[PDB]
Amino acid sequence: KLKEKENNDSSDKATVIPNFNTTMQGSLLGDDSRDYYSFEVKEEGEVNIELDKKDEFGVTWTLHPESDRITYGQVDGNKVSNKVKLRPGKYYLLVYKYSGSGNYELRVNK
Ligand SMILES: [Ca+2]
Ligand SMILES: [Ca+2]
Ligand SMILES: [Cl-]
Secondary structure, eight states, X not given: OEEOOXXXXXXXXXXXXXXXXXXXXXXXXXXXXXXXXXXXXXXXXEEEEEEEESSSSEEEEEEEEOOXXXXXXXXXXXXXXXXXXXOSEEEEEEEEEEESOXXXXXXXXX
């Protein structure tokens, strides 16, 4: 039932994802085109970031460490996904749209 917290349009205002394997609900309607999130890895491992589109629109995501290591989501229909091996540290996850408007769910699986 966890929801994003606007305004979250910059990493300094990112919505904390408190835990792995936890669904975050958000929306990118109208001129809300960016939702920043953050999370912390405590033990090195593979993380599977999964965005589920609840409406058809053009949305993806970009991951980078708080530390040019950058990872992009891979769009496949109504899922935008990737698997990346991450070391302990804090990470920023920018969910942003490139067309249209809609609702989504986000998980950082581990
Ligand atoms: Ca939003
Ligand atoms: Ca936002
Ligand atoms: Cl962990």
